[PDB]
Each structure stands twice: as C-alpha cells, then as structure tokens.
Amino acid sequence: MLSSTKEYLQALRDGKYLLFLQWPKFIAEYYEADEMVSLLIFEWLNNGFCLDDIKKFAILYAVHEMESRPLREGLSYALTTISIALFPCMVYLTNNLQEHYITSKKLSSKEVLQLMTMNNAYLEKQRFVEFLGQEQDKFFTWVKEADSSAVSKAFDQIYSVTYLKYLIEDYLSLLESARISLVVRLAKYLHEQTELTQDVHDEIAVYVKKLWEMAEFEEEFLKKISPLPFIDNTVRILTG
Amino acid sequence: MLSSTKEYLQALRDGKYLLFLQWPKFIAEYYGQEADEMVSLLIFEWLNNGFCLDDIKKFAILYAVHEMESRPLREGLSYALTTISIALFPCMVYLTNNLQEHYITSKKLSSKEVLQLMTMNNAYLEKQRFVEFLGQEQDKFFTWVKEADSSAVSKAFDQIYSVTYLKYLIEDYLSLLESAHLPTDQLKSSRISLVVRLAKYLHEQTELTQDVHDEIAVYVKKLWEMQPAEFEEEFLKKISPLPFIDNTVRILT
C-alpha cells in the first residue's frame, strides 16, 4: 500500500498501471460504491487532475479493451470504477467547477459527500448529464488516438504478471476439487507484484519445485508456469 | 465446415470442442437469426441427433472450461457456448419427461417448418411446469459442472487455449496496427491486409496442426518482410515463436 493519492496518481503518470489500480483499495482504508466514486472525484481534483492524467488513462483503458483481456475481475472493477469517476472530473474541469471541490482541510467520508451534495447546486441535474455524455465522447476519442506503441508496451507489462495470476488461480480451484495451503502463498505472493522482475521469476521456481514434494493434470500448468525446473527435475531421474 | 449435426455432436462426444462450438454457425446455414429461433433449431436438432446423458456430461466439461479465470472462450466462441446451453435445458426437460417423441422425425424440414413443430408441441407442457422443470435440470447440470473431472477439464483447456490464445492476440495486433500513426510507412496498408487474412485463416481452425503452424509462419514471414514498427515485433514474436524449451519439455513428458 502507498501513502498518498499523490503517489498513486504518480504511478499513473509513470506508466506503473498495475500499481495505480490499487488506488481504489487505498481509499478503502483511508475513509458501497456510490460513496466510492465520489471519494475519487474529490481525491483526483484536490490531487491535480489534468489533461495529461486523462490522456494517460486512455492508454490504460485501451489496454482494458484488448481482446486478450489482461485486466479481469478485481482489476477490471478497479479500472471501470475509476473511469466512472474520470467523467465527472472531466465535466468539472471543463465548466470550471473544479474549485469548489479543492480544499485544505482533511475531511471525513461523510463530510466529503456532504459538500459534493451541496455543490450539485452549481450544475442543474440535466446539464451534469449532458456534459457527462460529451466528456465521455471526448474521452473515447482519446482512447482511440492512444499511441499504439505505448498501449502495446503497457500490455506486456501488465499481462506478463496478470496471465500467471489467472493461470495460477485456475490451477488452484482445479486442485481444491480434484499442497493447497502451499499454492495460496504463490497466489498471495504473485498478488502483490506489480511486475515480473527477473528476481521475481526466480522466486517462482522456488515455488514450483516445492510443490512436487506433496497428478498428470497438474502437469501442463507447471509447464506453462516454470518449464526449466521441470526439465532439470525430470532429467535428474532419467540418469538413475 | 461439417455437414451434419451428427458430425458436430460426434465431435462433442470425442472431445473436439472448438469444432463442436462451430455447430450453431452450421445450423444457421443449413436453415438459411432471432436467438429464440436459433435455440429452437438447436433443440430440434439435438433431439433428433440422439441427445443423451453423456452429451450433457461432456458438455459440462466444456462449460467448466468456460468458467476458468484464464477465460479461454471469449466473444463469439462464448456466444456459441451460451446459446447452446440455452438449448440444453429444454432438451434435459424433454428427456426427463418423455416429450422428445413429439420432436423426433426423419422428415427433413425447413426453418419455418420446425418453428411450427415447436409451437405445436408447446401445448404438451404447461409453462409453469416447464419453468420448474427447467430449473431442476439447471440445478442437475451446474452440479455436474462443479464435479467435472479435473483431469478432463485441464486437458480440454490446454488444447482449446492453445488455439484460442492465438486468436485473441491476433485480433489485438490487428486493431493496434489499424490505430497506429504511420505517415512514412507505405507498407502499413499491405501489412494490415496480411493480419486480416491471418485472422481469417485462423478463424476456421480448431487445433494447431502442422499445416497451421506452417500457414501462420507464412503470414508472419511476409509481415517481417513488410518492415513492421517496433511494437508490431513483440506480436510477431509471440504469434510464430520457436519454443525449443516447450519442445524439449513435451518430449521429456
């Protein structure tokens, strides 16, 4: 967990996206999803919502729509949730309401929703919606204009990790209903990683091997996780 | 494509799933697409092609696969699967309750002719009972999905995803190439044309056989000769790789 919304919006600008998606998990401990989206509107405006922020999300969102769906479930909630917030912020920054939102004081969840309720007076319910639609439009075009080198490179980055997360997640339920307490750590280990570090792929093999100790179906999964320890492990016996 | 529901259902019994999922596309041609009509044809067809308890249990494997987190069946492959499940439940109801006879004939009918048969037979089960039955069978089914052999599911998975992972990646290459800003690049247009055709070739394929690897390689080769962008390269690499390791892992397997 990071210390600030400012650090999370840094990760976003730093193309750190697996990390930035934890932003809504941060606001969870620092204060329903009705409340949630409004916290992130407050949080983003007080933390320097800009055009660059929108534009760098349009990469992330474009990655989300990829047919290979690297971001799914928990991560996909994170992504869409935040996106629901980005549009109101987009309405606010455009019609110059961003100020009534910006403050000094350290507010509480109840007090936040309080002023956002009051601020609703500055925007008729009918126009809020009209701008929301236009801001959506203006966004989705930037989603289309998203530089494909940036999108692509981002994708490997995310999916490098993400793939194993599902591959492993699936290895678990298949095993539970077919050692288990063991794998959950590999699930919880990998859960924490933002990227596959060459040091991280090392700790993986330190898992794969340790399972062998405790089924023909488990096979092709390890083969898809850490092939090399297998090739070693099998040849070791073949010389008996 | 295949010429017979018997052929398709055979594939389902054999375990050839990507092929089995091609069924509702055949049914759409054999008859000439409101989903209710399409589910109607599937029910008729499956009941004449020897719907049975084993058909259900194997289909359970397929579904269990569709629910993996790696999500091997997306989009149209997914629509196939779900549309077939909507036909499945009525058949389970008709099977348990001895209604199938009214659905069984050797007379080769038309779409309009089957939809009429379907409405005629609608009067042999009162709606309320159909819905109760329908849920009982759904219960009976989803339990079998929870119980599907982990061996059998895991095997279907590797061999569906084997093809299917390629399918989605190639679609994502395609849209990115289209969406790329390439002013100098005079080959972009002929490179897009290559990916589209690769996408098209692969769309018909249910497994990676020697032929497939070879065609894929022919496309990927031509693409390299078209002088791709930096980002395109990662895609080309994944699409036709050389997994000397995996080669060496499976031999040893």
Numbering used by the authors:
A (entry chain B): 1 to 31, 39 to 185, 196 to 231, 234 to 259
B (entry chain A): 1 to 32, 38 to 258
Could you give the paper's own sentences about this structure?
This work identifies the first example of a bacterial guanine-nucleotide exchange factor that is active towards the Rab5 sub-cluster members, implying that the activation of these Rab proteins might be advantageous for the intracellular survival of Legionella.
This construct, which is referred to as Lpg0393Δ17, was crystallized and its crystal structure was determined by the single wavelength anomalous dispersion method. The N-terminal domain contains seven α-helices and makes roughly a 90° angle with the C-terminal domain that forms a helical bundle structure. The asymmetric unit of the crystal contained four molecules of Lpg0393Δ17 that formed two homodimer-like pairs, mainly through the association between two C-terminal domains. In contrast with the crystallographic observation, Lpg0393Δ17 was eluted from a gel-filtration column, with a deduced molecular weight of 35 kDa, close to the calculated monomeric size of the protein (31.5 kDa), and suggesting that the physiological state of the protein is monomeric.
